[PDB]
From Swiss-Prot:
Tissue: Isoform A: is specifically expressed in brain and testis and weakly in heart and skeletal muscle. Isoform B: widely expressed except for the liver. Highly expressed in endothelial cells and vascular smooth muscle cells, including blood vessels and mesenteric arteries. Isoform C: is expressed in brain, skeletal muscle and adipocytes. Isoform D is testis-specific.
Role description: Required to induce the formation and stabilization of endoplasmic reticulum (ER) tubules. They regulate membrane morphogenesis in the ER by promoting tubular ER production. They influence nuclear envelope expansion, nuclear pore complex formation and proper localization of inner nuclear membrane proteins. However each isoform have specific functions mainly depending on their tissue expression specificities.
Originating species: Homo sapiens (Human)
Coiled-coil zones: none
Entry comment, domain topic: Three regions, residues 59-172, 544-725 and the loop 66 amino acids, between the two transmembrane domains, known as Nogo-66 loop, appear to be responsible for the inhibitory effect on neurite outgrowth and the spreading of neurons. This Nogo-66 loop also mediates the binding of RTN4 to its receptor.
Subunit structure: Binds to RTN4R. Interacts with ATL1. Interacts with TMEM170A. Interacts with RTN4IP1.
N6-acetyllysine modification, residue list: 50
Taxon lineage: Eukaryota, Metazoa, Chordata, Craniata, Vertebrata
The protein, known as: Reticulon-4
Amino acid sequence: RIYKGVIQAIQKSDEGHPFRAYLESEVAISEELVQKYSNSALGHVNCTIKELRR
């Protein structure tokens, strides 16, 4: 129930996002990137990307 990332959330396209708002997303990805480690469970693969976050 993401809720935040619902279907209507697509409306964001209508809001014609600026640009910097997306950049900040880097903080979100950073959180996920670390979560990607889960993929590393399969020996290792996504963990390699984690290196980016350092």
